[PDB]
Symmetry: D2
Subunit: 499 residues, 4 copies
């Protein structure tokens, strides 16, 4: 069929029968930190709770953590726990009188020189980045205050100071943030504060990290060292925020466990129309790598204070799903907004609509056609299981995979049914929450044994699919698991009748 | 190749070598009515001037008409002129004010009507009867505004010459998420029909009074193009806006990015796989000419069509190059401004002769393509005429 | 890839690395009846011994039966035993002599019947009722001999376990050129049904009394295999012939060349594209196992099937490697000798246990493949059991 | 669709509606040299008359030529005229008593030494090939008398003499022919007799040559020189007769205008089962090169004296057509047989049946898929015209091509309708007779003018298709021709209604 052929046969009035495959990441804050409010989130469709370590102390976050664990255990939900780092920031200094008026056609001196720190004026002020004169060059741009103030660099005046053309009127106040479009920003992967944050996260047993401002594969390697041997199983989702991150996306994808497309930050740097396309490129490379991709910022922002978003906003969410994103993320809408439950429920309705309006077989065929023949046994088995789901119209795909690898591999092939992953580890259950289509179920091997014949895990997976309404008796399921000899990957498939 | 494989191989920082295929409708009002303001719009990327008959008098819009013709003649451009009806309100197809505005438009040589609040196929027939015999060559673009229009879309497409997706109107009745999917349905049914489709309302609204739009609005525009729309339309942004030229140039730049980001071969294959066998000679000749554009990597497709019909038919199949249409009618030049990929070029038969052996019209299409930097000597073009040719440009 | 691209890339002087998939039926008579002559046939490539009940008495054929079992036991081989009925002559399905010969065959443990002069589906039901309850597991291969059999082939295939294309009989009634095309139709309908098809009569007739056949006869044999036949059958060449061993070895060599010259993936795709969606679990598992053989380039497919059903079902899909079938029944070993690609291996459950976890039968299939030089440690195999596995041979 | 899907839907009782696309080459001789008998041949389905210059003088052949021209002109037929060369032969000498009995396990001495010419015996006899001891080596084989006598070379005795093992009983008589399997046979492309034959052929205006025993591309080049500037437009069809010809088939195809698969000769040299496959390989390489391929010898041999062939024979003809051959050839069946008209008519019935039982779209798709993209304009136009024929179900394809190149290019794409070729040259009409699907029609430009607008040739082509029953008014035809600027290839297509 094709996406076109799918479109002309949709009826937008028919009820949707699909089960929601995309996953919703929610940022926690004042509107949602309480145990009751977390319960609301989870009931409304939250699969991952994000802690924004730009704001708050460790105890603030500790309370998010403890409250999330009480609420989840009460509901019997597995909910991913994400730590989103502050990252290194480029800020200005102070200004006599707390701010300066700058007018287009003004020139201004920008100095990385510490002695102008707290005495900025309209003629000259401080900017924290020591490699200022090195990284930025006649003709390049410095953007300040969420990119509204645009400066074009005329010249280098001394090693400390650049002369700059003011592109637009702006009132600049103490400590605003700066961006350097198209530049190689010589800043560490992880700040000093980040290490300590990461160390907290490891101790508290987070599931994943959202690593800010990832620009090179080597920096992902730095995040990996900072988590250490103790955090070696924590996922690193690299946040792509600038041109350099988009340039190096291949090395960054290969080094990371997933990607976050941070559209707001990308937009300070890059024209809005190229951000739309960067989002597509990034999500698609992630789809082909079989690694989760999260779409973030500027989601349903207006629903932070209004009881409804604009249509342009709802279309931006849907098209994240149509581009292929595994996840969509809420920020202030859940953290400080007035409508945290409704935004999440609405986000989940948008996801359902997009999923139903997508021709899922076409994504399966696209991915499949990119495999080299001969395929490895592992790839052959997952792709063949997904095909089977299409051929017999099975209603769930059950994967026995302890680490979740094998659930991320089926999901990459995009079956049109839910994927159940039976795993011996709770951390896998929580880590699977960013992967499209997947519901993990925990197999307690301490209590029920090693299950060498896989029979208790196959029954558990089938039970999980019955409880969720995915299957009834007489429906088919496709099962993927290891034999009695292979370790590392399931090399074995069954097509079973639900009983 | 697939959209998926196209996306992974894109470089967003490479310069774009494509030539903009999507077309931009602009609403004319106080910001844009003067001769010099229309010149700027046309330079900025306007292909169609819309007159919103919900507001102003006949004499108001007469000024638009007269200034548009002055501005377009001066630049050498063929610009479609559209009359967008008030429609009825709180129903009949056309109100009494509508009958009068349509009679005026017929009298003033309009190209097309945007008919408000089309709910059924029979209603499109009433607009047609209202344009009558004298308005029989004016195009009707039915505006889809409510659930019933969405429901009756197959019959309304069959009866109309095109469709306008009025997102803001639909969103009063239908939840936002179903307007998003209704847009997809309407655009793709009109792609399969071979008929122009215009995306309207809520485009870059914020640029009415700000110098830059939000990314979400930029994404909504790119999405209209990805969905398959021929045209995007501007309302207040150009009618009342503070930055009319800038919002047009910007809407142009978005279209071009979306276009470069699209795997056009996928659209072509998908349209082609829907064709009944055996095809009519007409379908076969146009799909096969487009197929040849892909096979020999031609850099332009040239259609000789006096009515513009076979230009629309080639455009349906989505070649990944510009379509030049040599026509003996100015009115066809204006009417093709809503058709994706087409640059019309007028062949003056009075001046140059009847051209039975098509040779002069072929040389005109080729020089038109050279003039625009679409081709240079040694490139390939595919030519369709009343017949197909594959030629080297010299 | 296509048959066309396979042919241009073939090298006829390269050694063949394929393992012979097609199967050879031999008629037993005076040239071939002794224990030592049957040993030679079996070594030469016989998979099925045919007894032509048009001639000789019960006691004559009893000797064949007893000598075949002695010879096969000695070599360790499972050889199908077939009873080919006289049929009626100048009509009923089965004559009186037929009822008696069938009763004898049922009593002697035959594998399959070749039922002469099948004209309708109802006639196949009469042969079935004549084998009765005691002969309910004997296969009926309906011999197609006239225009009516050809006409009623869909119903006759549905009712039978297989078909025999009796070219010489068909050629009495139907022009030679329509027998050529009727052969194509019957073979391809049985390929699509998943049921064995035997090509018979006029195979290498001239080798009855000469040491070499003509090229035209060699071509007719290769053609049967290209058409899609599971099996080729020898009559007088082995029954009365001067060179029985040589005609078998030669028929084997022809099959192997035709096989090497066939693009097997094309047959697989063509069969697979006929499948209704949704498939049954059984169709899905076998096509998908064969698909995997092509995807990972496995060197053998192993089916655990006690009845041989899923071995026939995998064979339908035409993998380009050997199919090993581990079965708990000798009778299934004998019955699979008419099924393209299959080497059956007997799993002695009495000796080795019930094997619920399939492990011993899997190790048996793998060692069977090693023993025949189909695989070596490090190759891939695909295993189907009551479930699919892709395994490295160790 | 596929060939399989085509097969299961055939009814072999339905009348055939197709028009015969394959072409029948007939060898002329005593049964068929008369003007009346040529007329019978032509009426029965002959498209090419072959002269076998192994037998007969120039005047014998002159009479074939003059009689063929009278019969064809009387019928208004274009009939190809082929000269099939003798070629160099390897013969034995004489034997005392006119022949020797040789028994398996005998050894015998074979000598290329002239002085044993006329005095052969059971112990030693003469064989004409001076490079005997050089070309054939311990372990190689010499085959004699249409390959029934097999000798295995034990050793070289002197420069002149090989010692040989007799593989089988045989009675050997004066002058029998010898073959050297798997050998590089050091013999000229063209004998002395061949040159003179070729010279006759050029003078008499033959259409094509069947060149015997072509083993290398360089030898085709030698045939080309021997025809000369005067014969530069005569087609060379290379006869492939041994292993070396099959080894070098690529260079030979590229140098020749077509191929003849000479199955009988191949069979002396190569096991019968490998001949079947060589035939497939050769025909398919020819199909992809868009050059005619003729299948020859051992066709319906038994119908030389019997009023009907065996089924094995009829199947061998059909499968030449199914392999893709443009032509099938009769030899003694028409030259000396008792049933020359019936064999030809029957051969044409077999061709019809095979054509109808072939899925022609599958050959079109196979050929098409072997083109590199970007295609040249010429290839794009022919393949696109053939596609059009399939898409609109046109009933003829009309190609305006003076040299016939463009008719050979459509035919390669295998449309399921007849191809009409309008050409300004009678020699093209006669040369097109070996090309599948094609009926040429002569456009007399001397009389009707240059037809710069192509309109008289398009009408002529349509008239030709009406006269032959291919089209009626309201049917469609696809037309391929040049514009007012392109020379060398038609770059222009029309789809027209027949009126
Ligand atoms: O939604 S959209 O954005 O697309 C959109 C569509 C239509 C729109 N219509 N806008 C207008 C603007 C002016 C206008 N009439 N002005 C005048 C007037 O009314 C009178 S009167 O005495 O009271 O009659 C005397 C005047 C004397 C002079 S002057 O002496 O030369 O200075 C100049 C003008 C007027 C009219 S309308 O003709 O009344 O309809 C309509 C706007 C937006
Ligand atoms: O078409 S196919 O090529 O597949 C095909 C199918 C079946 C075919 N059947 N061939 C035969 C051969 C012999 C034969 N009976 N022989 C004997 C016999 O008859 C008598 S009796 O006194 O007259 O009864 C006494 C004998 C004493 C001795 S001895 O004392 O040990 O030397 C040995 C033999 C016989 C029979 S049958 O049993 O009569 O039917 C059938 C052949 C070909
Ligand atoms: K953060
Ligand atoms: K309006
Ligand atoms: K019989
Ligand atoms: K000859």
């Amino acid at each position: 069929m094709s996406q076109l052929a799918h479109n002309v046969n949709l009826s937008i009035f028919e009820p949707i029968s699909h089960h929601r495959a995309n996953r919703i990441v929610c940022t926690i804050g004042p509107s949602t930190q309480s145990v009751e409010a977390l319960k609301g989130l989870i009931r409304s469709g939250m699969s991952v709770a994000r802690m924004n370590f730009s704001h708050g102390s460790h105890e603030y976050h500790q309370t998010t953590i403890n409250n999330l664990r009480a609420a989840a255990t009460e509901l019997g939900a597995h909910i991913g726990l994400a730590l989103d780092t502050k990252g290194p920031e480029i800020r200005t200094g102070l200004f006599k009188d707390g701010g300066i008026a700058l007018a287009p056609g003004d020139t201004v001196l920008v100095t990385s020189d510490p002695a102008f720190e707290k005495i900025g004026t309209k003629e000259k002020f401080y900017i924290e980045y020591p490699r200022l004169s090195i990284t930025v060059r006649p003709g390049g741009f410095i953007y300040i205050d969420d990119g509204v103030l645009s400066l074009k660099v005329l010249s280098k005046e001394d090693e400390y100071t650049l002369k700059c053309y003011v592109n637009n009127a702006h009132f600049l106040t103490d400590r605003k943030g700066c961006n350097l479009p198209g530049c190689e920003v010589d800043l560490p992967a992880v700040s000093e504060k980040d290490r300590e944050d990461l160390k907290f996260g490891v101790e508290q047993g987070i599931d994943m990290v959202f690593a800010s401002f990832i620009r090179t594969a080597e920096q992902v390697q730095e995040v990996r060292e900072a988590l250490g041997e103790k955090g070696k199983d924590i996922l690193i989702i690299s946040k792509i925020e600038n041109h350099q991150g988009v340039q190096n996306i291949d090395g960054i994808i290969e080094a990371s466990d997933g990607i976050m497309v941070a559209r707001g930050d990308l937009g300070v740097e890059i024209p809005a129309e190229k951000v739309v396309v960067a989002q597509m490129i990034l999500i698609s490379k992630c789809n082909v790598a079989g690694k989760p991709v999260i779409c973030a910022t500027q989601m349903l922002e207006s629903m932070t204070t209004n009881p409804r978003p604009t249509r342009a906003e709802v279309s931006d969410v849907a098209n994240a799903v149509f581009n292929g994103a595994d996840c969509v993320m809420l920020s202030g809408e859940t953290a400080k907004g007035k409508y945290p439950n409704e935004v999440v429920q609405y986000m989940a309705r948008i996801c359902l609509e997009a999923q139903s309006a997508t021709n899922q077989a076409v994504m399966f065929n696209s991915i499949k056609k990119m495999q080299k023949l001969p395929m490895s046994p592992e790839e052959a088995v997952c792709s063949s299981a997904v095909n089977s789901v299409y051929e017999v119209r099975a209603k769930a795909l059950l994967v026995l995979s302890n680490s979740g690898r094998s659930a991320r591999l089926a999901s990459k092939y995009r079956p049109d049914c839910p994927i159940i992953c039976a795993t011996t580890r709770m951390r896998t259950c929580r880590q699977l929450t960013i992967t499209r289509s997947v519901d993990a179920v925990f197999y307690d091997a301490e209590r029920y044994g090693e299950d060498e014949n896989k029979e208790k895990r196959v029954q558990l997976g089938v039970d999980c699919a019955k409880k969720k309404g995915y299957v009834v008796p007489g429906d088919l399921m496709v099962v993927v698991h290891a034999d009695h000899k292979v370790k590392g990957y399931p090399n074995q498939t069954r097509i079973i009748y639900v009983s």
